[PDB]
Design a protein around this ligand. Structure first.
Ligand SMILES: COC(=O)C1=C(C)CC(=O)c2c1cc1c(c2O)C(=O)c2c(O)cccc2C1=O
Ligand SMILES: COC(=O)C1=C(C)CC(=O)c2c1cc1c(c2O)C(=O)c2c(O)cccc2C1=O
Ligand SMILES: COC(=O)C1=C(C)CC(=O)c2c1cc1c(c2O)C(=O)c2c(O)cccc2C1=O
Ligand SMILES: COC(=O)C1=C(C)CC(=O)c2c1cc1c(c2O)C(=O)c2c(O)cccc2C1=O
Lengths: 142, 142, 142, 142
């Protein structure tokens, strides 16, 4: 139950935008490999930046709802659903202003009480469908 | 565009619960083959009953959002997303009170200005996941 | 484990087309509510007809693979994946001859050793995408 | 049609494992941001390494089937379906030896006749379900 509660605190940060206490539950060595192309590198600051990015992209009304959280050893798996609105540029695609919802799975390793390894799997295909199958502009993503 | 607007009127009925005017856009011969196991048979009354059932099952806050509507001949295809809350018994499963969202596709044939043939394809599997993989009780569905 | 094995026998019938022994594991009162619009009514014969329809529609190479089977009381839930090819008319849509695969969930009630209540939830939306978003012809489905 | 054919050549490489000619259709500056955590960096060699990784992970029988390919300007969008078998370690998860299939969307920018920007969106959640919801081992992914 300790580990489930740590992951619920991470979920809560995405829902409130609250990053002042991330050093209490994000490991110094935190890395989410998806964040690198944004410039977002390691530790509590990287996680704070990721929260910021999610809210900037999918709006201050984004909601991550919990379906269920599982654990095995030091690993925690969170089955969530994201509810958002496409209000920020996303992989080179201007904001469609379209609402969407999609299931997501997160996998996290807890190391000495804090989240150190974090992978997430959005329902990218369903999000793109709900956004009307957007395209990047000439600027693109790189 | 006429046919797209008829289907938008159907979508709107699910969003408002408004069934007083269904005879203006639902064909006398309307049939949705999924409705039969509820007792819901043909024409405008069957469609009214279906609206009622959707709102009773997925709540008076259910929302059907439009992604896109396509047509070919007398056929219209609606790409929607349902947002709801499981507040009514569903295929023998007591209400979980869980929020969910899922894409849905509807296919309708327009006959003399009114919806006559109607099939819908919910994201049943994703809904069930978001409801925590519920089970029917001893009463079941039949 | 008895009930899991009964459902595996049902899965096997779809994979082999073998219907000579359906009276041994399909209840006299069997009903799948989806089958009614094809004319397919109750008991072992209805189930045999459904096997036939699946193979006629999604080809003699259709394969239903097992992910996992769960039970609770008299209920069994089968998480499967269908692999097929669209070789028969489907809801008024001529055969695209396209290969597809989609997860499916089946829910069955076992009554005195035999399958009596059967609901299935195909990934209809994903199947339709993989078939290139087909349309019904003028004949339609009714 | 030129750009569609370039993307079909990329699809074909995943299906045959053929990487001797990647410099003819992969830009010197090619980057897929997902590949970085494997060590796989830029250009034709990075793409060759990615083909290798896909076949090592999802087997020499992996098949990427084409649903449809769209283009807009220099951008190409490929709607595919992957058929594979989990035979290599995947994000810290030992091979389950389970077959799976999942839709995938790829987005590519063509620059002077060659693929330069490449993002892919697997159906990760559906793959994980079909693999029986595997877990990483103690070694993990990092
Ligand atoms: C609640 O957070 C996320 O959903 C998320 C996180 C934590 C980190 C990420 O890097 C992404 C997303 C979500 C997301 C995408 C992320 O990179 C993305 O690229 C993405 C995309 O490229 C196209 C459609 C939807 C997307 C997403 O929902
Ligand atoms: C907005 O309407 C629907 O979603 C809908 C309609 C119009 C008619 C129907 O018969 C069903 C649904 C939705 C629906 C189910 C319907 O029969 C259903 O059985 C169903 C289910 O059995 C399990 C999970 C979700 C479900 C649904 O979202
Ligand atoms: C392995 O069996 C099935 O997939 C199945 C069964 C047992 C009974 C059924 O009535 C249907 C399907 C599958 C199916 C559809 C069934 O009615 C269907 O209408 C259907 C559809 O209308 C559009 C796309 C895919 C479909 C399916 O895969
Ligand atoms: C045909 O190629 C791919 O599917 C693919 C490619 C080109 C590049 C990639 O980096 C990934 C995948 C597929 C893939 C994953 C990739 O990174 C992955 O991490 C992945 C995963 O982490 C869990 C389940 C399925 C997965 C995949 O199908």
């Amino acid at each position: 139950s300790r580990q489930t509660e740590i992951v619920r605190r991470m979920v809560s940060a995405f829902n409130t935008g609250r990053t002042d206490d991330v050093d209490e539950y994000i490991h110094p060595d935190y890395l989410n490999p998806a964040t690198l192309e944004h410039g977002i590198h390691t530790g509590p600051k990287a996680f704070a930046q990721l929260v910021g990015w999610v809210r900037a992209t999918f709006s201050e009304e984004a909601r991550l709802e919990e379906v269920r959280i599982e654990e095995r050893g030091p690993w925690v798996k969170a089955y969530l659903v994201l509810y958002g609105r496409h209000v920020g540029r996303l992989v080179g695609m201007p904001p469609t202003d379209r609402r969407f919802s999609g299931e997501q799975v997160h996998l996290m390793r807890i190391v000495d009480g804090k989240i150190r390894d974090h992978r997430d799997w959005p329902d990218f295909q369903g999000t793109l469908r709900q956004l009307g199958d957007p395209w990047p502009d000439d600027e693109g993503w790189r």
